[PDB]
Design a protein around this ligand. Structure first.
Ligand SMILES: Nc1ncnc2c1ncn2[C@@H]1O[C@H](COP(=O)(O)OP(=O)(O)OP(=O)(O)O)[C@@H](O)[C@H]1O
Ligand SMILES: Nc1ncnc2c1ncn2[C@@H]1O[C@H](COP(=O)(O)OP(=O)(O)OP(=O)(O)O)[C@@H](O)[C@H]1O
Ligand SMILES: [Mg+2]
Ligand SMILES: [Mg+2]
Lengths: 392, 244, 385, 239, 241
């Protein structure tokens, strides 16, 4: 069924669903007449009866292993001795991918259907199923970075006309390197908000597995799942985790991490020539990354993130305190807009702390004293810096 | 008849599907053409997949009709996806030279005029280009027996009668093109909305002449350069409004 | 008028449900038909269930069959197979009841070794690769020429080299020059990523390589593209703790398969790596690797050819100075030139211009080569080479 | 205006006329010309024209109805309604979009990337080339290769020359190039050139004397079935 | 003792230590200098991260090498004053050896030479500083402004800026300064230098320090009460136009 315009009541709207019913009844009449003309003894719904009786019951479940001499196959059920099952006509010979789940017949054990996986026991967590929240309005400033990320990841998907006319393949990947707590994750949430593509997030820690084998296995599975659900906006985050840390649970140690990184650097570029799989990584330490990953042709536009300036600080204060039960005594102009160094995370942290403190007193309105107390609270809970002493 | 309101278009898609389900072999080799004429110059996603399904089917004439329906469906849009499908079919239907010839004709029609011209039957404001529909019907009437036009291929130039450019051109008052920002996005109807809602969704701030595909309108981003014609398609003339 | 709207909306669902019910996840296609009810004819023949089992010692005739885990029967033939068609190691379609050798089957191959066989020939050609004329010539003379025209090698009575390295800095064209070979060849092009040969359980990489080489030998002419062999390429070394000895085991199994107590059998193999330094000298030894290509950073003429190849498309303004652009980009791998072309195309889009000019290309090349210089790969990996 | 397609007739004409009356009283002729074209009443289009005193609106309505390919006769405007400025507009488009560089039919095929009767393949290539460089007035496959026509055999020679007229569509310049192939004694070549003559001026109508009609009318009465067929086909295409 | 080479030619041709010192300079405070007909002005900013830094004993960002030539730096402050000490002792030695007050060109050549030697000698990392040298030669009224890079390359600039966000100040000077028509007054030079600074400093009138160099052994340091005086009319003329 199609969509319906307009939203409100209108005679033309009634005409539209009148056309809908007219065409629907006309399809129904055509199908009825066609069926009645057909020889029911081999037509109508007797095909369902024949399919059910030939299929037999119950249909067992096994695993396909080969398609040699089509109309023949070697299934391998977990308990059966790997029969030489023949392939029937009802099954579609295009979904019989070696390694699928076929439906053997109970007694004669002839394939009478392919059971699609449709499980996604782990991907369901990965697959973005509900847009997080924040749109691009919630990001204060950062206009250049937003423009770059848009023209790299959004425009190729929503508006390919500019790129195909211009004759350039879109920039493959983007890495968001910058100082910690500066919106590198927020911008990913924003691009996930407005999207017509699947958004499979992954964090670099999860690629540091425990067993030797399941280091490249996970990456291969992730990129295969991204490929089949094209297009994909895979968001490998904390990509520096593979380099540092050196987890004890990792059995291989450094070597297994190296193999996993090699598999990643292949799957990003590949001999396989994957389709529309955009890659967006973000990290705090761009330094400790093997330059194979960040090489052009794998991730082209390396967007730099920088701590906000005074105007950006005041814009962040305005956007974050927009949903405030603020008393007039609070002055946003001198609130945190002090030029004594802040970050994109501090401005929200002090707001959260002040809101919690106001909740503690059960004051539904926010006082300037509470905002100042949360300001100093955030200031003390801050590892200041180290390299400034060189230039101090 | 269904080639009017797009709701009739979408219903006719299912109509042709059902008829293809229960149809005799003479009517089998037109359901592709039925999709093509109905969905010309707008390569919608749900149109060409069933056409691809029927392209690998038997009744070689059905396959020829399916690929020609692709060609009509992708008329001038330069759709790389449908171009890849057509190239794949060229690889497959290479033994039968007639299929190869009609495949190459569909390839040529796919990228007609390098993408600056289309077979669109009905333009903005739903005017009817009777010449374009006449040409399409002329090329589709007798191709239930495609061997006829394989013999007499001179009628394949009939598309040149209903062919037209598809572009914007901000002509100055004197009669010369002038650069101006043109807002291009997906068309939306103004029926139930109140006030002054926008007629464009997903705007692109594009400059002077662009190529708006089937399903997009145009509107002047700049406050100045007042267009005498409200419907910004085809040739457009502008005047300098003194404001700003 | 909503009194009309109510049943107007109701009819939609009612009629669609009626149509779905009247017309009637796991099947083929009823509209395609092809699911004829003649399957009873191919169904009454209860010979379709055939136990699979690997044959064994051929008792001079009686056959010993080793049904996976049901039994270890000793069985005769089934009159449908010639007595000389069964040999030890073959898989037999043993009959279910009153077991018999009915149908020999192809040797068991691991599924995970099956999808590593490209049937989707990639979209590149030898025209794409530029600035590597001599290297592409050597790659041709090793891989393509022996299969295309083997008569000359018979006239000279020589064996063309079987095995070729593709060392070089990253993003130089190695994978590109293998994809071009895959497109322009007529033989099977089994691809192997280095990390795929690292399984979990001990000794599984050796089985991986053995089954892969058996599959390759099954075909008349095959090309193997062992890639990122840096993964399974560790030089033999001892540290007391037996570090990553499984990868070493897989590597020695590969080395034995390439040249052991049995000839290879027309299995021309292409390797590719970005750090050839860490390869065991046994692999570098000729016999398993004959020619060692040197994909390196292109020169000025190479840069001009790269720009021409990657700018065959694009609405470039006529009169652009490609020589000047190539000169103002020293020691940059071809991937960086491709990125320069992409960014030059992009900068025109942001300014809404439909044609990118020289002033745009200069800005793009400055931004890419100079701005993105700290994140460059061609300066560390050059030392490894 | 959206009521017309769905609303049951004959009230559709009443809706069109009422909307036309609304638009005329408000001097918004931009939509009014479109509703007039929907109705098809020529006197109604004339009344739209008499409601305008500014020449620029006359030119713009002329452009709209020329895009609609409707032959409404008006003095001082006949060039625009005759689609005579379409060729210059299209060559300006080609210059601005940098699409002047012609594309080979092989470039469309890309058979070089996908690879390990000659007459029919030449016919297909000619059709592809004619569709590609339509209106750009420049090509390298056929314009510079006269022996190219001879590769096609039988009816293929006709479409070969017709591709030149297709490339020179909307341009009266192409008549010179098509003229030379008219002198070839082969009836198929004459028919192909004569058919391409109409396409070279298809949808183009000067106010006084169409050259395509003058050159075309002589060959209609030719006893050859092929030549007369091409003549009538070109007459239908041009007008 | 330490003989190991620290500056090694990279496979792409650059020296990694020198090009790292370029970035080390890129993180320093912005310092800008312009010259008029007979006046050269060295403008500089200060760090605003920490407060409660007095003015009297705080080391001046612009250090006096001699009575006629002054130096300003950017980048690592630790290493720069070593170059200052070496330049001062070399200037005194030049006075002893040639009986002539030092010239801007010779001092800049010496500074470039010592930075080059440290890029050459083994066991020593290159300086992480970039210096600006301004002053007047003896018996000459022409202001000379010189920039010295850690790589050892020195050049004359009619107006140059170094440090963080130096690109913005460079492009600003590229359009609000004319090389062929320099400002004719000390006030105009100071106004241009100040207006250049607010493009980056974005408040911080307290920690904006400006040194004005004049011929005939005249070097002055404008105090805050004059810098804010200039800032007053500069911000007055900014928003209203
Ligand atoms: N410009 C901004 N506008 C709005 N919110 C911002 C901005 N910059 C930072 N924030 C806020 O900072 C919070 C914490 O920062 P965020 O998680 O985005 O940083 P990150 O650097 O990506 O993270 P991490 O360093 O932990 O990987 C976010 O929840 C976001 O709301
Ligand atoms: N000579 C060349 N001709 C054409 N394109 C080239 C050339 N050299 C490099 N390129 C471009 O750069 C890339 C070639 O490198 P590719 O992506 O195949 O990776 P690689 O060199 O195998 O990488 P790694 O060594 O990290 O595995 C392609 O995207 C290609 O377009
Ligand atoms: Mg983060
Ligand atoms: Mg590679």
């Amino acid at each position: 069924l199609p969509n319906i315009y307009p939203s409100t009541r209108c005679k033309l709207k009634l005409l539209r669903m009148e056309r809908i019913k007219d065409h629907l009844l006309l399809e129904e009449e055509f199908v009825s007449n066609s069926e009645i003309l057909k020889p029911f003894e081999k037509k109508q719904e007797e095909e369902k009866k024949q399919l059910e009786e030939i299929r037999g019951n119950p249909l067992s479940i096994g695993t396909l292993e080969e398609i040699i001499d089509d109309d023949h196959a070697i299934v391998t059920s977990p308990t059966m001795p790997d029969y030489y099952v023949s392939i029937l006509s009802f099954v579609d010979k295009e979904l019989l991918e070696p390694g699928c789940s076929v439906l053997l017949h109970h007694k004669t054990m002839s394939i009478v259907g392919v059971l699609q996986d449709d499980a996604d026991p782990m991907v369901s967590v990965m697959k973005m199923d509900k847009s997080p929240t924040e749109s691009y309005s919630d990001i204060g400033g950062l206009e250049s970075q937003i423009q770059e990320i848009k023209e790299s990841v959004e425009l190729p998907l929503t508006h390919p006309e500019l790129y195909e006319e211009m004759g350039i393949k879109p920039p493959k990947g983007v890495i968001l390197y910058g100082a910690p707590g500066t919106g590198k994750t927020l911008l990913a949430k924003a691009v996930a908000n407005q999207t017509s593509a699947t958004f499979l997030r992954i964090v670099g820690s999860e690629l540091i597995q425990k067993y030797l084998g399941d280091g490249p296995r996970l990456c291969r599975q992730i990129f295969k799942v991204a490929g089949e659900n094209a297009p994909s906006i895979v968001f490998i985050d904390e990509i520096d985790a593979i380099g540092t840390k050196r987890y004890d649970s990792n059995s291989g140690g450094e070597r297994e991490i190296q193999r996993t990184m090699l598999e990643l650097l292949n799957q990003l570029d590949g001999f396989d020539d994957r389709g529309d799989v955009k890659v967006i990584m973000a990290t705090n330490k761009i330094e400790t990354l093997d330059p194979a990953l960040i090489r052009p042709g794998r991730i082209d536009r390396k967007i730099l993130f920088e701590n906000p300036d005074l105007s950006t600080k005041k814009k962040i204060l305005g956007i974050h305190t927009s949903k405030m039960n603020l008393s007039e005594d609070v002055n946003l102009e001198t609130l945190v807009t002090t030029k004594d160094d802040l970050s994109g995370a501090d401005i929200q942290a002090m707001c959260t702390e002040a809101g919690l403190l106001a909740l503690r007193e059960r004051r539904m309105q926010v006082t300037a004293e509470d905002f100042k107390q949360a300001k100093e609270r955030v200031m003390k809970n801050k590892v200041e810096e180290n390299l400034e002493g060189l230039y101090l | 008849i269904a080639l009017g309101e797009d709701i009739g278009k979408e219903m006719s898609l299912r109509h042709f599907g059902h008829l293809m389900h229960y149809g005799n072999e003479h009517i089998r080799r037109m359901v592709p053409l039925a999709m093509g004429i109905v969905s010309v110059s707008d390569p919608q996603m749900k149109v060409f997949d069933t056409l691809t399904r029927f392209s690998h089917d038997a009744d070689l004439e059905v396959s020829m009709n399916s690929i020609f329906a692709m060609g009509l469906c992708g008329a001038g849009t330069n759709n790389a996806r449908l171009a890849q499908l057509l190239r794949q079919l060229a690889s497959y239907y290479s033994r039968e030279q007639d299929a190869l010839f009609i495949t190459r004709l569909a390839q040529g029609l796919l990228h007609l005029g390098k993408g600056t011209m289309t077979m669109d039957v009905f333009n903005d404001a739903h005017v009817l280009n009777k010449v374009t529909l006449a040409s399409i019907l002329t090329t589709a009437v007798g191709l239930v027996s495609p061997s006829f036009m394989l013999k007499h291929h001179q009628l394949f130039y009939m598309l040149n009668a209903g062919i037209r450019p598809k572009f914007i051109l901000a002509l100055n008052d004197e009669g010369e093109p002038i650069k101006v920002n043109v807002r291009v996005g997906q068309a939306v109807e103004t029926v139930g909305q109140a006030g002054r809602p926008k007629k464009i969704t997903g705007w692109i701030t594009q400059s002077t002449p662009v190529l708006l595909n089937h399903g997009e309108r145009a509107e002047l981003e700049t406050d100045e350069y007042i267009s005498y014609t409200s419907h910004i398609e085809g040739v457009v003339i502008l005047k300098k409004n003194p404001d700003y | 008028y909503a009194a009309k709207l109510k049943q107007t909306e109701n009819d939609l669902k009612d009629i669609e449900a009626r149509i779905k019910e009247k017309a009637g996840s796991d099947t083929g296609l009823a509209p395609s038909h092809l699911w004829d009810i003649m399957g009873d004819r191919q169904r009454l023949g209860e010979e379709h269930p055939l136990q699979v089992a690997r044959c064994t010692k051929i008792i001079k005739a009686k056959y010993v069959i080793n049904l996976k885990q049901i039994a270890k029967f000793v069985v005769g033939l089934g009159e449908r197979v010639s007595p000389t068609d069964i040999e030890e190691g073959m898989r037999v379609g043993v009959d279910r009841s009153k077991y018999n050798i009915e149908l020999p089957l192809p040797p068991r191959i691991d599924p995970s070794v099956t999808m590593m066989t490209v049937e989707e020939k990639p979209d590149v050609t030898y025209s794409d690769v530029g600035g590597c004329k001599d290297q592409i010539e050597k790659l041709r003379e090793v891989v393509e020429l022996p299969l295309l025209s083997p008569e000359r090698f018979a006239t000279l009575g020589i064996d063309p080299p079987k095995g070729i390295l593709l060392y070089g800095p990253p993003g130089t064209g190695k994978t590109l020059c293998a994809r071009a070979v895959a497109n322009r060849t007529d033989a099977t092009f089994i691809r192997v990523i280095g990390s795929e040969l690292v399984q979990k359980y001990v000794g599984e990489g050796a089985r991986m390589v053995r089954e892969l080489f058996e599959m390759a030998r099954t075909k008349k002419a095959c090309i193997i593209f062992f890639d990122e062999i840096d993964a399974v390429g560790g030089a033999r070394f001892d540290d007391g703790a037996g570090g990553d000895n499984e990868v070493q085991r897989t590597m020695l199994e590969l080395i034995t398969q390439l040249d052991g107590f049995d000839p290879r059998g027309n299995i021309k193999v292409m390797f590719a790596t970005n750090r050839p330094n860490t390869l065991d000298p046994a692999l570098l030894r000729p016999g398993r690797i004959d020619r060692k290509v040197e994909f390196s950073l292109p020169d000025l003429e190479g840069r001009a050819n790269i720009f021409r190849i990657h700018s065959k498309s694009m609405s470039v303004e006529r009169g652009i100075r490609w020589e000047l652009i190539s000169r103002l980009c020293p020691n940059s791998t071809g991937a960086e030139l491709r990125s320069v072309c992409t960014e030059a195309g992009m900068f025109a889009i942001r300014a809404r211009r439909k044609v990118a000019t020289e002033k745009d290309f200069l800005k793009a090349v400055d931004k890419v080569i100079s701005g993105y210089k700290k994140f460059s790969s061609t300066s560390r990996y050059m030392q490894y080479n | 205006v959206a009521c017309v397609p769905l609303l049951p007739p004959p009230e559709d004409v009443a809706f069109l006329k009422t909307a036309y009356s609304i638009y005329l009283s408000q001097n918004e002729l931009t939509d009014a010309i479109a509703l007039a074209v929907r109705l098809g009443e020529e006197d109604m289009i004339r009344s739209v024209f008499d409601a305008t005193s500014d020449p620029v609106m006359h030119k713009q309505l002329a452009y709209i109805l020329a895009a609609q390919k409707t032959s409404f006769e008006y003095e001082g405007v006949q060039d625009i309604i005759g689609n005579g400025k379409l060729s210059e507009h299209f060559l300006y488009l080609a210059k601005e979009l940098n699409l002047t560089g012609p594309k080979v039919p092989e470039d469309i095929y890309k058979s070089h990337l996908d690879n390990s009767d000659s007459a029919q393949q030449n016919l297909a290539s000619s059709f592809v080339n004619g569709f590609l460089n339509l209106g750009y007035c420049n090509d390298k496959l056929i314009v510079d290769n006269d022996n190219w026509v001879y590769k096609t055999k039988g009816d293929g020679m006709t479409s070969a020359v017709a591709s030149i007229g297709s490339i020179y569509q909307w341009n009266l310049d192409g008549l010179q190039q098509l003229d030379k192939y008219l002198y070839v004694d082969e009836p198929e070549v004459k028919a192909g050139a004569l058919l391409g003559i109409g396409i070279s001026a298809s949808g183009v109508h000067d106010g006084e004397v169409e050259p395509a009609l003058l050159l075309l009318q002589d060959y209609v009465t030719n006893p050859d079935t092929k030549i007369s067929s091409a003549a009538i086909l070109g007459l239908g295409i041009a007008f | 003792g330490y003989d190991r080479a620290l500056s090694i030619f990279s496979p792409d041709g650059h020296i990694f230590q020198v090009e790292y010192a370029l970035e080390a300079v890129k993180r320093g405070t912005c310092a800008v200098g312009v010259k008029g007909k007979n006046c050269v002005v060295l403008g500089c900013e200060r760090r605003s991260t920490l407060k409660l830094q007095d003015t009297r004993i705080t080391p001046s960002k612009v250090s006096k090498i001699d009575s006629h030539v002054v130096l300003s730096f950017s980048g690592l402050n630790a290493d720069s004053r070593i170059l200052i000490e070496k330049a001062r002792v070399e200037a005194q030695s030049h006075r002893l050896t040639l009986e002539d007050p030092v010239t801007v060109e010779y001092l800049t050549r010496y500074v470039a030479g010592v930075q080059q030697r440290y890029t050459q000698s083994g066991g020593v990392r290159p300086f992480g500083v970039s210096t600006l040298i301004a002053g007047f030669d003896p018996r000459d009224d022409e202001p000379k402004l010189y920039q010295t890079e850690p790589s050892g390359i020195y050049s004359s600039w009619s107006a140059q800026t170094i440090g963080r966000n130096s690109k913005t100040v460079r492009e600003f000077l590229e359009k609000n300064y004319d090389r062929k028509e320099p400002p004719a007054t000390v006030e105009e030079c100071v106004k241009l230098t100040v207006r250049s600074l607010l493009e980056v400093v974005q408040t911080g009138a307290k920690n904006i320090e400006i040194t004005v160099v004049k011929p005939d052994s005249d070097i002055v340091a404008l105090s805050s009460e004059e810098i804010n005086q200039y800032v007053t009319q500069i911000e007055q003329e900014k928003q209203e136009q």
